[PDB]
From a paper:
The first step of methanol metabolism, the oxidation with molecular oxygen to formaldehyde and hydrogen peroxide, is catalysed by alcohol oxidase (AOX) (EC 1.1.3.13) and occurs in specialized organelles, the peroxisomes, where H2O2 is decomposed by catalase. AOX catalyses the oxidation of small primary alcohols using a two-step mechanism, first a reductive half-reaction, where the substrate is oxidised while the FAD is reduced to FADH2, followed by an oxidative half-reaction, where the flavin is reoxidized by O2 and H2O2 is produced. AOX is with 663 amino acids larger than any of the other proteins, mainly due to a more than 70 residues long insert near the C-terminus that is thought to be involved in oligomerisation.
Unlike the other GMC family proteins, which act as monomers or dimers, AOX forms an octameric complex, consisting of two tetramers stacked face to face. The FAD density was also well resolved and indicated an FAD conformation typical for the GMC family. Structural elements unique for AOX are mostly located in the C-terminal half of the protein and include, apart from some short sections, a loop (364–392) including two α-helices connecting two β-strands of the 5-stranded parallel sheet (see below), a 75-residue insert (477–551) and a ~25 residue C-terminal extension (637–663). The AOX-specific inserts are located at the periphery of the monomer, where they mediate the inter-subunit contacts and form a tightly packed oligomer. The FAD is buried deep inside the complex in an elongated conformation as in the other GMC family enzymes. In AOX, the dimer interface is close to the FAD isoalloxazine ring and the substrate binding pocket and the conserved side chain of His515 in the 75-residue AOX-specific oligomerisation loop appears to be part of the substrate binding pocket. Loss of this interaction in the monomer may be the cause of the observed inactivation of the FAD-containing monomer. The crystal contacts are formed by helix H12, which extends from the side of the octamer.
Author numbering:
A (entry chain A): 57 to 111
B (entry chain A), C (entry chain A): 2 to 663
D (entry chain A): 499 to 553
Amino acid sequence: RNMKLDSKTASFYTSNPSPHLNGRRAIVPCANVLGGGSSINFMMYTRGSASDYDD
Amino acid sequence: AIPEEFDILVLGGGSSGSCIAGRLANLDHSLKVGLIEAGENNLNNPWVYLPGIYPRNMKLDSKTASFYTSNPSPHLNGRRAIVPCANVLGGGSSINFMMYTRGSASDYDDFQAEGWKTKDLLPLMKKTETYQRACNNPDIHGFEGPIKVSFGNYTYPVCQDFLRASESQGIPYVDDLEDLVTAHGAEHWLKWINRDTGRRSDSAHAFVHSTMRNHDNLYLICNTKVDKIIVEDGRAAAVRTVPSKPLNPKKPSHKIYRARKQIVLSCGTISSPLVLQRSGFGDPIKLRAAGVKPLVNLPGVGRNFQDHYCFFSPYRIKPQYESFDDFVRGDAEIQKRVFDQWYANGTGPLATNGIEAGVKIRPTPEELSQMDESFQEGYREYFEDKPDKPVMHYSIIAGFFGDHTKIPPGKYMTMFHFLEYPFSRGSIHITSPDPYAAPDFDPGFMNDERDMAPMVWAYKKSRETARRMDHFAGEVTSHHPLFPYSSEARALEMDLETSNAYGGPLNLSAGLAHGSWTQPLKKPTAKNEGHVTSNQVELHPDIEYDEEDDKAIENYIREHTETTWHCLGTCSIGPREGSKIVKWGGVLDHRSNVYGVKGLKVGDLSVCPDNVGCNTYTTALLIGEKTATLVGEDLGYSGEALDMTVPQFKLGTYEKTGLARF
Amino acid sequence: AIPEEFDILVLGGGSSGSCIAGRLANLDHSLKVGLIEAGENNLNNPWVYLPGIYPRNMKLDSKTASFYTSNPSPHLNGRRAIVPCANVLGGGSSINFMMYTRGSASDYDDFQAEGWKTKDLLPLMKKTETYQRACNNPDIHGFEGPIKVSFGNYTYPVCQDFLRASESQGIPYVDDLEDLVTAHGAEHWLKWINRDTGRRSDSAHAFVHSTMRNHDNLYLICNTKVDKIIVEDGRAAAVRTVPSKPLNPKKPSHKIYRARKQIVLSCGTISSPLVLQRSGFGDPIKLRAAGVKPLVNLPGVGRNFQDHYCFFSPYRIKPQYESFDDFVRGDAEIQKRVFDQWYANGTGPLATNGIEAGVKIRPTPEELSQMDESFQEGYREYFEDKPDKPVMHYSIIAGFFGDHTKIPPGKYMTMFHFLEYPFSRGSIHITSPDPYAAPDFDPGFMNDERDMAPMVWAYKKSRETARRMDHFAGEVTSHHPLFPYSSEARALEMDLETSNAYGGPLNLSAGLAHGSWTQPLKKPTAKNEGHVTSNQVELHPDIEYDEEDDKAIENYIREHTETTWHCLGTCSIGPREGSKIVKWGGVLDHRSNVYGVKGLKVGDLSVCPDNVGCNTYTTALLIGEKTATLVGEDLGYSGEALDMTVPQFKLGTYEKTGLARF
Amino acid sequence: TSNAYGGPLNLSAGLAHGSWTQPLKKPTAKNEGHVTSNQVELHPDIEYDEEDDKA
Ligand SMILES: Cc1cc2nc3c(=O)[nH]c(=O)nc-3n(C[C@H](O)[C@H](O)[C@H](O)COP(=O)(O)OP(=O)(O)OC[C@H]3O[C@@H](n4cnc5c(N)ncnc54)[C@H](O)[C@@H]3O)c2cc1C
Ligand SMILES: Cc1cc2nc3c(=O)[nH]c(=O)nc-3n(C[C@H](O)[C@H](O)[C@H](O)COP(=O)(O)OP(=O)(O)OC[C@H]3O[C@@H](n4cnc5c(N)ncnc54)[C@H](O)[C@@H]3O)c2cc1C
Ligand SMILES: [Mg+2]
Ligand SMILES: [Mg+2]
Ligand SMILES: [Mg+2]
C-alpha cells in the first residue's frame, strides 16, 4: 500500500523522457516518513559481496 | 412408433430446416413429413427459450456447438480460427445473439436467379414474422407472422449515449434501418425476442413444436447424424444415418430412411457440402482422395465459402452505470434477482439480448481517400455501382462478450464490428468416408488484400464513438491493438479515483503502478459555464494516427478476427458451367434442385451465391420458405392454400386486445 | 426512414405537446405529423413508468432536468433560485410528483378569451381522463379518457391523521375538492397513477407511444433541440434544429425540417419564449443586444412569468409509524422488498406517489385581520370579488422530500405548501444567438410586498395541524425558521426516550446534550379517564407568536422558497396593444395564433394570462387539446369525428368486467 | 461526496430544494512542478464584517 500513487508516504519524482525506454518517463519514488524507506521497504534482507566495499 | 418410409424427409434441424418442416407439414396434413436432426431436442429448455444466457452457448466445453477448426493460415499470422456450428434442434436460432436486421434490396437482386428477386420475395419475407415494434413503414414488415420481433423487456441506458455519440460523427439516425434502402444509419437495434413473454423467438418452437402438438403427421428424429444420401435410378430415395455419438465401438449402428417423393438438405453451410460430398457429389479427383466414388460432377460443392469478420474491442465503463457483465461473471446474488424478476414478472435484464444500438456505414469519399489504394479499387467496382450497400457494421454490447476469467474485474461496454461483404472466398472438403471425421477447410479470412482497410477504418471510427459516450472510463489496454508505448494514439486505462471506486475501500493496491503496465487517462475538459446544464458536455481529446500506429491496428485485426457465423456459399445457385459470381460453377438450379440428380433439394442458408449485408437469420427463414413453396409447387399442389400457416394464438396490440404487453 | 418535410410539426415533447401530437395524428391518419423533442425517448423506461422513485428525477446530476439558474435578487436575500425544467419525452409528466388537482371555474373565466371559458372547456376536460376513484360528482369527471387517475395501490396511514387534524381547525372535509367550486376543504389527494397497473400515467405513453404502435403516420424525432423557426413570405415554414449535446466541436451540425401547413410550439413556458426570441419575435431594442434581427414586434414575449412558491417544513414522526423515508434513504434490504412486492403483485409502497392528503384554504376575516395591511389591500381587490379562489394550499408528504444526506437519521412527515396565486410577475430573455446559451431571467419571487403574509400564515397553520397529528414526535429544528433561542414559539425536537428508540440499544450518545443544540419536547397532557378509549386524546400546547417570532418565519420563507414548476406566462393570450391582465401586451390571439405571422401556434402551458389555482398538469392536457381542436378546425376538417380518440383497451370497473382492479 | 456517503442506491444525493445548504466549491488545483509530496490544494480564506460577527 505504501507505494500507491496517492499514498502520503512517498514523493514520486518523475524523470525526463528517454528514447532508451521508448519515450517512457519512469517515476522514481522516494520515502517520505520518519525512518525513511525502512518504514516502507519490502523488508528483503541481503548483503553485498566483499569485493564491493573494496571497490 | 416411427416408420421407415417418410413422405417428405427434411434433413437438418436448422432454423431454415424447421421452416421447411413446419410449413411443409401444414399444407396437406395427410402428407407425411419426417424431420431428422443431428442433435438434442430443445422443447421447453430453459437454457434455450430465455434470451439473456446466450453467451454460455458458445463455451468450448458447451454441448450445443461443434467448433470446427481451420487449417493454419499466414494471413491470420499462423492463427487457426475455430468455426463453430450449431448442434441443437432449431439450429442456430436456439443459440444466436438474437440480433435482428435485414439485407439490402440489391443483395437478393445479386443472386440473379430466375426467381429470388427482392420484388418477389418481399411478400414472403412479410409472411414470416410479426413485428412487435411501433412500425412506421408498415408496407414491408409483417404484422402477424409466427416469429416475433421486438426491443425486449429491458433496455440498458447505453443505447441513448451510443446514438447521441454516433449522430455527432455525421451518421444520420434512421428510425428503420431494415427498410432495405439505406447505407448510413443508426437505430435502437431490434431483437428476436417475444416481447409478450420474454422468450427467445427461435424457429423450432414457432414452426416445429407448435405443429406437432396440433398435428399428428410430423415426425421428429433427433439424435441421428446423417451419413450419406443414397441415390439410384436417378432419384434420391434414401438417407442412411448414424448415431450422433459412437458409444458402442464394437458394433457400429446405422439406419436407412426412405423418402417417397422428396428429400431436402437443411444441414447448414458447413455440414451440407460434406453430406453431398460423402454421397459422391464433387470433383472425382478431389473425391478419390477420400475414396468415395464420384457419382455426379459438381466442382462447385464446398467452394465459395463466405463469412463476416467480427472482432471485439472492450472499453471500460464508469462504476455507476449498469451492465450485464456482473450477471455472466457471475455472482450468486445478482443472478438470483435477475431470474427472480423474470419468473415473477417476465421483464428483467434476463429478458434481453445484450446488444443495444448499432450503425451501418458507407464511407465518405473524403475519408475514403486515405484508405489503401487496393480497397479504393475494390470500392469502385463493387460499391461505386450500388448505393444501397453498407461496407461495414458495428453495434454496442452492454457488457463484455468474452471470457471474464481472463479480463480485469469491472464493468465494460464492448464494441462489436463485422465487415458486411468480405471479398475473400473460402472452401471446404471431406477428408474421410467417416461421418465423424473432421473436414479440412480454409475459411480464407483476409485471403484478399482488399479486406483490411475497412476493418482498420471501423476500429478508428468505433473508438471515436466510444470516446464520446457518457459512459466511457477508459480502454482496456490488454484487449486493444499493441500501439508503440509512447504513442499519443495509445489505449489509456481508467482514472485513479475510478480505480479506487472499483477496488473497494479496503484495497491495498489501487493507483499503485509499477512496471508501467498501463497509462492513466487524463481528465475531461471542463464543462462550459453559461450553457444550459442539460447541454453541457465534457469531452476527451481526439486521437490521431501515423503509419506505425496503423500497422498495430492491422496486426490486431489479423490476430483477432473470427467467423461471425454468417457463413454461406458452398453449395450455391448458378449455371452448372460456371459464372462470374461463382467461378467454380454452381450446383443448385434456380429452383434449388441439385444438378445431375432428381428429387434432391437444398434448404440451407448455403444457397446464396454472394453475401447479404445483414445478419443471416432472416435469410435463413426466407430461403426456407422459398424452398418450402418450391416443394409445394413441385408436388403440383394448387396456389390456393399454397400458403402454409402454422397454428398460433395471435396476440394483438395491447390497445386492440387486453392480453398482450410487457 | 425519416423524411425532411412533415405535414404538421409539433415542437416539444411536453405533456401538452404529446397531447397535441397524439390527438392530431389520430384525426386523419393520412396526415403526416412529425414530433421533434429535445431529450431522450422514454418508452418502457423503468425509472419513468413506476411512480415511487419520483424524487430521484430532481437530483442536480440528474439527466432528466435542465436546472436554469436565476439572477440574484435582494428579495430572496441574495439567493439565486434554480428553476428546473423537464428534459425527457413526455415532458414533466415523466417527472412530476403525480399530484392531481383541478383549478377554480373562475380561473378559465379570467383568461377572458373569445373562447377558453370554463363552460366550453368542461367537456374537453371531461374527454382527457378516466377516473378510477369512486366518483360522486360524475357529471364532471370523465370516465373513459386515455389518462388514468386514482389513489394508487398503497396508502400511508398519515392521511387519516391529517384529516382528523385539519377538521379540528375549522377546515371542512369535502369528498371532492376538484369540483371547481370550493375554497376550504380537505381530501385524500388523488394521483396520476394507473391503479389497474401501478404505472405512472404520463401523457407520452397514453398519447404518443400508444398511437405509434397502432399508426404509421407519426414520427418521433428525439434528441434534437430546436434552434430557430424560419419564417418567410409571412408563413412559418421551417424549423432548423441542432443536436441536444455538442459532442463534435470542430464540425457543428444542424438540420432544417419543413412543415407543409402547420407548426406548433409546445416547448414549455421557459424554452418557448426563448425559441420565439431567437426567431426575432420581441422588442427590437432588447433583441439587438443578442444581435438577432427583429422580424415582428412582440414586447410581451418573455414577460409576465408566473410560478407557485412551495417550501417544505419537515416534522419528525414516531419510530413505530411507516414512511418512504427509509426506501429513498436508501437501504439495500427495504428497497429490495419494495420492488419485489411490485413485480410480484403491483401493489406496494413503490406503487404510490408520496403525498397523501391536503387542504386548500381561504382565510377567515377574523384571522385575516392580523395579516399585513398590504395583503389585506390585495385581498379586497383580488379575492374579495371572487369566492371560488383559495389563497393558499398545503398537503402532507409521508416522508422527507429532500437530501437525506444532510438531515439527521429518522423517519419524517414533511408538510408541503405552495401559494395559489402569487401576485409577483417575472420575465425571461435570451442573451445569445446560440441555442445552448443560458438565458438571463428574473422569476421575481417575492418581488411584490403582498406575497409574504399568506406564506407566513400558512406556516403558522400547517405547524398547528402537524402538532395535532397522532404521528408527531417533534420538529426538526435545523429545517425550521430560526426563532430566538428562548422563545416559546421555538421548534422542539424529539423526546429523550424516542431518541433512544432511534439510536438503537448500543448507542453511546442518545440524550447526551452539550452546547444546547436542541431542546427536548415536553410530554403530552395525559389522556382523560372516563372517555371512551377510542375518543381519548393527548395533545401538545398551542404556540403563540410575537413580532420577533414573525420576522424569523419571514426570513425563513425568503431564504427557502423555490419554484413549484407551475411556471406559466411568457407568451400569453391578450390584445397585441396590451391589457390590464398583461401589461406588456399579449402575443397569442384567442385562437392561439402568434401575432404578426401566419401558420404558427403555441400549445404550451405558457399560454395562460394568469394563474390557475391548481397543479398545472391538468391545464397542460386541457390547453393541448384546445390547440389540437383549433388545428383541427384550422385544417377545415368537419366537426364530425373532430374528436380524436387515441387507441386504448378500456378497462371497466371491476364489477362491470373482471379484468380491472388492485 | 454526497454520493459517496449516500451509497449507490440513494434516490436523493445532490437533490437540493429549499436551498437548505450550499455546496462547497472545488479546491484550487495542485501546482505542477512541485514535488508530489509538497503539492497542496486549498480552499479560499474567508472574511468577516459586522453582520457576520454578530452571528
Ligand atoms: C453463436 C451464434 C450466434 C449467432 N448470432 C446471430 C444473430 O444474432 N443474428 C443472426 O442473424 N444470426 C446469428 N447467428 C447465425 C445464424 O443463426 C445462422 O446463419 C443460421 O441459424 C443458419 O441456419 P442454417 O439453417 O443455415 O444452419 P443451422 O441453423 O446450423 O442448421 C443446421 C442443422 O443441421 C444439423 N446438422 C449438421 N450436420 C448434420 C448431419 N450430418 N446430419 C444431421 N444433422 C446435421 C445441425 O446440428 C443443425 O441443427 C449466430 C450463430 C451462432 C452459431
Ligand atoms: C419535478 C417536477 C414535479 C412536478 N410535479 C407536479 C405535480 O405533481 N402535479 C402537477 O400538476 N404538476 C407538476 N409538475 C409541473 C407540470 O409537470 C408542468 O406544468 C407541465 O408538465 C408543463 O408541461 P409543458 O407541456 O408546458 O412543458 P414541458 O412538459 O416541460 O414540455 C416541454 C418539452 O419541450 C422540450 N424542449 C424545451 N426546449 C426545447 C427546444 N429548444 N427544442 C426542442 N425541445 C425543447 C423539453 O425537453 C420538454 O420535453 C412538476 C414539474 C416538475 C418538473
Ligand atoms: Mg530511496
Ligand atoms: Mg452456422
Ligand atoms: Mg416545467
